[PDB]
Amino acid sequence: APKAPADGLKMDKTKQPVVYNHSTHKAVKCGDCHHPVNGKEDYQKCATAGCHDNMDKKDKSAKGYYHAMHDKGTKFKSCVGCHLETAGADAAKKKELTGCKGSKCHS
Ligand code: HEM
Ligand code: HEM
Ligand code: HEM
Ligand code: HEM
């Protein structure tokens, strides 16, 4: 089976890079993120060609990289989508986990 990589992974396809730590996400199944494609959980980098390789941040297709990290109502919960549920009504946690600046994702 695939193993989780080290913490401190930098996602840097964009000018707003974000650090991702697997160890704070163990309660999420691997395949909620590394989701099935053609019936098999896909562990490739998310922006692999043919995957979320569209770097236009307004795109909402299955190729839109920004969309896959930020939007709600997606087939798999996005970073922000899941964090909004986690924070609930707690405004401090909303800032920490979902804020567009000054959050744990974006400075
Ligand atoms: C569950 C224990 C789990 C595994 C296994 C796993 C593996 C994994 C690998 C091998 C990579 C590196 C991919 C590469 O070749 O560079 C990787 C990277 C990311 N992961 Fe992961 N991962 C597991 C769990 C989770 C969970 C639960 C999430 C979502 C909350 C998640 C997300 C990511 C992200 C984002 C990356 C970086 C990918 C990129 O920038 O393209 N993983 N993981
Ligand atoms: C990398 C860890 C990674 C993330 C993160 C990710 C997210 C993601 C979301 C949030 C969706 C739903 C979007 C919606 O509008 O419903 C989604 C959908 C698909 N993805 Fe993805 N995805 C990651 C990785 C990969 C990889 C490595 C590929 C290409 C092999 C890929 C492709 C797709 C496709 C196709 C979809 C649509 C799937 C379907 O509708 O069943 N993703 N992804
Ligand atoms: C998507 C790639 C994604 C990112 C980026 C992300 C980041 C992130 C940070 C920076 C934290 C704070 C802890 C740390 O520094 O590692 C954090 C915490 C939680 N997350 Fe997350 N997260 C991403 C994706 C997801 C997804 C898809 C879910 C749920 C399905 C999820 C959940 C959580 C939870 C729960 C935490 C802990 C909350 C707390 O208050 O610290 N994340 N994430
Ligand atoms: C708040 C809703 C919010 C906004 C707005 C926002 C913006 C943003 C931009 C402009 C980028 C770069 C897009 C581009 O292609 O130029 C970007 C990138 C990432 N973000 Fe973000 N972001 C907002 C909030 C959050 C939060 C709270 C997280 C983490 C849960 C998060 C995550 C990400 C990720 C991952 C990326 C991609 C990093 C990379 O590969 O460079 N965003 N965001």
From Swiss-Prot:
GO terms for cellular component: periplasmic space. The keyword tRNA processing does not apply. Participates in sulfate respiration coupled with phosphorylation by transferring electrons from the enzyme dehydrogenase to ferredoxin. The lineage of its organism: Bacteria, Pseudomonadati, Thermodesulfobacteriota, Desulfovibrionia, Desulfovibrionales. Heme c 2 binds at residues 35, 46, 51-52. Binds 4 heme c groups per subunit. It comes from Nitratidesulfovibrio vulgaris (strain DSM 19637 / Miyazaki F) (Desulfovibrio vulgaris). Heme c 3 binds at residues 25, 79, 82-83. GO terms for molecular function: electron transfer activity; heme binding; metal ion binding. It is found in: Periplasm. Its main location: periplasm. One of its GO terms (biological process) is anaerobic respiration. This is Cytochrome c3. It comes from the Bacteria. Heme c 4 binds at residues 70, 100, 105-106. Keywords: Electron transport, Heme, Iron, Metal-binding, Periplasm, Signal, Sulfate respiration, Transport. The second and fourth heme binding sites have unusual CXXXXCH motifs. The keyword Electron transport applies. Heme c 1 binds at residues 22, 30, 33-34.
